Amino acid sequence: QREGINASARYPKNWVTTGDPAREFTMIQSAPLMLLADPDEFVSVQLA
Amino acid sequence: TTAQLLAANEQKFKFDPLFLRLFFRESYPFTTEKVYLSQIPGLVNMALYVSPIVSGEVIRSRGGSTSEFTPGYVKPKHEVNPQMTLRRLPDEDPQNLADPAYRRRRIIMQNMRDEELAIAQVEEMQAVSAVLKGKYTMTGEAFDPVEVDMGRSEENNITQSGGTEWSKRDKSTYDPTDDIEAYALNASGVVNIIVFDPKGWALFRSFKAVKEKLDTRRGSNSELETAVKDLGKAVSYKGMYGDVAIVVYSGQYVENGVKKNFLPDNTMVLGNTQARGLRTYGCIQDADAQREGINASARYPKNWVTTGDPAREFTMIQSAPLMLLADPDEFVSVQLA
Amino acid sequence: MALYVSPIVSGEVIRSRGGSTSEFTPGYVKPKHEVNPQMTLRRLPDEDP
Amino acid sequence: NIIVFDPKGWALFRSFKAVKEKLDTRRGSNSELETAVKDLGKAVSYKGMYGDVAIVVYSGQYVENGVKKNFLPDNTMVLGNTQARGLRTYGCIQDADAQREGINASARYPKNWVTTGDPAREFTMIQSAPLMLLADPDEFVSVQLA
Amino acid sequence: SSRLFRTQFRMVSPKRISNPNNTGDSRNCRAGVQINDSGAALGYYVSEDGYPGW
Amino acid sequence: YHGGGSGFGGQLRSWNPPSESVDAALLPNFT
Amino acid sequence: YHGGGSGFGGQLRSWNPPSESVDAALLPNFT
């Protein structure tokens, strides 16, 4: 919200802890969910 | 009961980096885990007589030596919190006066000053302990012990013993010059400067021969300052003595509350004013510092806010210094008991 | 003097230093002289007859 | 930079042979003195250099009840800086007429008035608030010699 | 410099002119400006541009 | 000069802006 | 300069806009 991102793809950020031993991290996060509008246009058989 | 603050002095101790300035120049920052110093013997066996028939005894080609060192780390820090801000400061008038915000920008300023002064003291002691003796050991409560040991021959660091003590022998009809020559015979290369210690200078000056070397019409060209010359400064570039330059150094550093002297109680340090000195600064190890792209520097400052209940804006400086002596046999240290 | 600290360990928060304050107050002094005409009637010591 | 002497103290200082010898060396010093008779009636008399210090012999007088009393005790010697921080404060002036003619917080406010009466007399008065300070009380060393 | 004219001018802010070492005003040195026996000036005391507090 | 003093009736006794250069008064808050 | 500080009486204590280029200020909310 501070940089104006609401429900986008793969929001990254790169931040630093403030302390005498400091360690930067690196993180990207997303909220995936894949759907098939018509669930039945397919036929996945098991062969033998 | 109104008031006014006419004068507000500040106290200081005698501090000037003479030893660092004279002998340690040409700072070389490095980005490396460890540095190398290499010495080569350069001793040549005399060409022994050989009959024109035997034709033998090939000579080994000379090979040198190296060393590796690791720079230490030092990090002082201070603080400021809203509690100190409100009351007052001892350096503002009861009149005039300022908002609480400005007192913080003054406290941070004096904190910066103290940090830089502490780092400078560390560098100076770092240098002085390297000039006087071949080695020093950097130790601390949380710093694992690492030492630096330049290869100085044992025949240097000469100290007086049960015989030939200046204090015990008579102050009239004796020469210090012969002892100075015998001591300085060891150093590799010419000697051009002598760095006394006030007690040592007082002992040296009182000799009857040393006065005589000064007031002779045709037996010398030396000139000194026997009377009182410098009383408040930490250095005293006195006159030359034949060829060498005489210097008296009285500089003070503080460890705990008390004040201590750099030069330990009347030592004498023969040396060359152009001695090859190395001022090596390591790599600063701080995540933000490497974010900025800064490495192999000195005095990296920063501040931050701790988001705790009382807040606090800390202040920190990091150095990682290490002073080297390329050749450790161009100095001769004498105790002068 | 800044004692050595490892890169990992955090240094102690070194205490800041504060000053001392003194107070003072002044005091007066005033001389007073008086002249009346009976002094002016006669002749001063350094006046020609 | 400076050393202040009472003539007895200066006499005791220069009487030694060593100080006399410090002036005969042609290269052993840089000190110029006036160890002879320099001033005989004046109060202050600078007497040259000595290394870097500058010896001055001070013999003044002040009278408190009468007689004549000299400012320094008999044998004293002051080591002090010639640029030492010293500030001269003058306090406010507590007279009604001073406000009327627009003078306050100054030194040596003079006034002159005549009492209204059948015998009338005229008075003369000067008043101040003299206070003397030092910013650093520890810069001067005061000894007593013998 | 190797140009035709070597003269240059620098603008100094009035805040910089101050007594050395922040001492008080003496008779011959008022507010960082030297004054001779008459009222005319003789020389000026200039501080150094200090942006950092230290 | 009343401008540099306490003020009319002490109204300005808390307005004491620091005497700092333009740089030290601009750069810390530039961004 | 009071522009980069708290303000008159603390009225600008919460006005801390992010310093970002036009690309990062327009694109995420373009549509």
UniProtKB/Swiss-Prot annotation, chain B:
The keyword Membrane does not apply. Keywords: Capsid protein, Host cytoplasm, Late protein, T=7 icosahedral capsid protein, Virion. The keyword Ribonucleoprotein does not apply. Gene3D superfamilies: capsid protein of prophage domain, putative capsid protein of prophage domain like. It holds the Pfam family Phage_cap_E. It is found in: Virion; Host cytoplasm. GO terms for cellular component: host cell cytoplasm; T=7 icosahedral viral capsid; viral capsid. It comes from the Viruses. Assembles to form an icosahedral capsid with a T=7 symmetry. The icosahedral capsid is about 60 nm in diameter and composed of 415 major capsid proteins. The assembly is primed by the interaction between capsid assembly protease and portal dodecamer, and major capsid proteins assemble cooperatively to form the procapsid with the help of capsid scaffolding protein. Major capsid protein forms hexons and pentons of the icosahedron. Viral genomic DNA is packaged into the procapsid through the portal vertex. Belongs to the lambda phage major capsid protein family. Homomultimer. Interacts with FI protein. This is Major capsid protein. The gene is E.
From Swiss-Prot, chains F, G:
It comes from the Viruses. Proteolytically cleaved by the viral protease during capsid maturation. It is found in: Virion. Belongs to the siphoviridae portal protein family. Homododecamer. Interacts with the terminase complex composed of two small and one large terminase subunits. Forms the portal vertex of the capsid. This portal plays critical roles in head assembly, genome packaging, neck/tail attachment, and genome ejection. The portal protein multimerizes as a single ring-shaped homododecamer arranged around a central channel. Binds to the terminase subunits to form the packaging machine. This is Portal protein B. It comes from Escherichia phage lambda. The lineage of its organism: Viruses, Duplodnaviria, Heunggongvirae, Uroviricota, Caudoviricetes. The gene is B. The chain holds residues 24 to 54 of 533 of the full protein.
